[PDB]
Amino acid sequence: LAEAAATTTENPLQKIDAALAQVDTLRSDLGAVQNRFNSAITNLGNTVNN
Amino acid sequence: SISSLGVGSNLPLDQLLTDLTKNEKGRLTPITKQQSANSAKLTAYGTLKS
């Protein structure tokens, strides 16, 4: 469960920046996979036609 | 110029050749799809630039 903090958090900006970096990384990977799949679909269409 | 056909056959050669041409043109469609997608992307880029 989410604990109740007894003190003030230190350098929270660093934690938030780390989280944002995580999200950016994941978005980059997802975009890469999207492009991969689109290229795959195009290849499959050409192959089925041939 | 005339492109007469079946003149002495009486078989329905004309529409048969037409149907051939149709099915043969079938092969060109995927290229059309690719072109359409890319053109839409370019127009979208233009809108974003605006």
Tab-separated table of C-alpha atoms in Angstrom:
chain	number	residue	atom	x	y	z
A	1	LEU	CA	0.000	0.000	0.000
A	2	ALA	CA	1.016	3.631	-0.402
A	3	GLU	CA	2.857	4.655	2.759
A	4	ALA	CA	2.445	7.983	4.538
A	5	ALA	CA	5.650	10.005	4.293
A	6	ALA	CA	6.875	11.256	7.667
A	7	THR	CA	9.319	13.811	6.216
A	8	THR	CA	9.842	16.108	3.244
A	9	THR	CA	11.120	14.520	0.048
A	10	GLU	CA	14.572	15.552	-1.172
A	11	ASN	CA	15.500	16.345	-4.776
A	12	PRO	CA	12.080	15.277	-6.118
A	13	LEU	CA	12.927	16.963	-9.418
A	14	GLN	CA	15.481	14.226	-10.052
A	15	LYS	CA	12.914	11.485	-9.440
A	16	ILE	CA	10.386	13.155	-11.736
A	17	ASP	CA	13.012	13.561	-14.453
A	18	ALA	CA	13.917	9.884	-14.138
A	19	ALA	CA	10.263	8.920	-14.533
A	20	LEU	CA	9.930	11.120	-17.605
A	21	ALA	CA	13.050	9.526	-19.080
A	22	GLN	CA	11.528	6.088	-18.511
A	23	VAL	CA	8.380	7.137	-20.350
A	24	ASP	CA	10.361	8.601	-23.249
A	25	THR	CA	12.358	5.392	-23.579
A	26	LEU	CA	9.227	3.261	-23.697
A	27	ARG	CA	7.615	5.559	-26.262
A	28	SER	CA	10.702	5.317	-28.465
A	29	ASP	CA	10.588	1.517	-28.390
A	30	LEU	CA	6.870	1.464	-29.142
A	31	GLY	CA	7.308	3.741	-32.142
A	32	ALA	CA	10.099	1.528	-33.438
A	33	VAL	CA	7.913	-1.563	-33.198
A	34	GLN	CA	5.046	0.270	-34.902
A	35	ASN	CA	7.266	1.101	-37.861
A	36	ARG	CA	8.496	-2.488	-37.976
A	37	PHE	CA	4.962	-3.858	-38.099
A	38	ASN	CA	3.877	-1.420	-40.810
A	39	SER	CA	6.818	-2.393	-43.000
A	40	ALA	CA	5.960	-6.039	-42.371
A	41	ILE	CA	2.367	-5.507	-43.489
A	42	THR	CA	3.537	-3.888	-46.711
A	43	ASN	CA	5.897	-6.790	-47.408
A	44	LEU	CA	3.107	-9.283	-46.785
A	45	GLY	CA	0.795	-7.501	-49.205
A	46	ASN	CA	3.387	-7.543	-51.964
A	47	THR	CA	4.219	-11.194	-51.310
A	48	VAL	CA	0.595	-12.324	-51.367
A	49	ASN	CA	0.015	-10.492	-54.638
A	50	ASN	CA	3.050	-12.115	-56.250
B	1	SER	CA	-7.770	1.850	-85.512
B	2	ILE	CA	-11.012	-0.105	-85.842
B	3	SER	CA	-9.886	-2.754	-83.343
B	4	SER	CA	-12.695	-5.002	-84.540
B	5	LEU	CA	-12.762	-8.456	-83.006
B	6	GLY	CA	-14.861	-11.560	-83.327
B	7	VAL	CA	-15.587	-10.298	-86.835
B	8	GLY	CA	-15.699	-13.884	-88.060
B	9	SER	CA	-15.766	-15.781	-84.765
B	10	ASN	CA	-19.151	-14.808	-83.246
B	11	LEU	CA	-17.623	-15.600	-79.848
B	12	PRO	CA	-17.887	-12.744	-77.327
B	13	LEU	CA	-14.174	-12.035	-77.642
B	14	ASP	CA	-14.522	-8.286	-77.103
B	15	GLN	CA	-15.877	-8.196	-73.564
B	16	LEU	CA	-13.657	-11.161	-72.716
B	17	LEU	CA	-10.562	-9.135	-73.579
B	18	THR	CA	-12.011	-6.224	-71.621
B	19	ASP	CA	-12.348	-8.448	-68.552
B	20	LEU	CA	-8.785	-9.619	-69.075
B	21	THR	CA	-7.523	-6.043	-69.055
B	22	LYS	CA	-9.501	-5.385	-65.869
B	23	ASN	CA	-8.043	-8.329	-63.980
B	24	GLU	CA	-4.551	-7.535	-65.261
B	25	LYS	CA	-4.825	-3.958	-64.021
B	26	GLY	CA	-5.628	-5.584	-60.697
B	27	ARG	CA	-1.870	-5.884	-60.143
B	28	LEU	CA	-1.321	-2.120	-59.830
B	29	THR	CA	-3.461	-1.438	-56.749
B	30	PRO	CA	-0.943	-1.883	-53.878
B	31	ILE	CA	1.358	0.723	-55.400
B	32	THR	CA	-1.609	3.088	-55.490
B	33	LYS	CA	-2.248	2.450	-51.801
B	34	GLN	CA	1.368	3.165	-50.901
B	35	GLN	CA	1.371	6.380	-52.932
B	36	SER	CA	-1.870	7.522	-51.311
B	37	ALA	CA	-0.588	6.942	-47.790
B	38	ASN	CA	2.662	8.802	-48.397
B	39	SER	CA	0.904	11.729	-50.073
B	40	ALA	CA	-1.441	12.049	-47.108
B	41	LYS	CA	1.597	12.121	-44.831
B	42	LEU	CA	3.143	14.957	-46.840
B	43	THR	CA	-0.056	17.004	-46.673
B	44	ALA	CA	-0.156	16.431	-42.916
B	45	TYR	CA	3.392	17.755	-42.665
B	46	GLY	CA	2.258	20.856	-44.524
B	47	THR	CA	-0.576	21.423	-42.063
B	48	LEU	CA	1.787	21.034	-39.116
B	49	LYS	CA	4.155	23.562	-40.667
B	50	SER	CA	1.286	26.024	-41.007
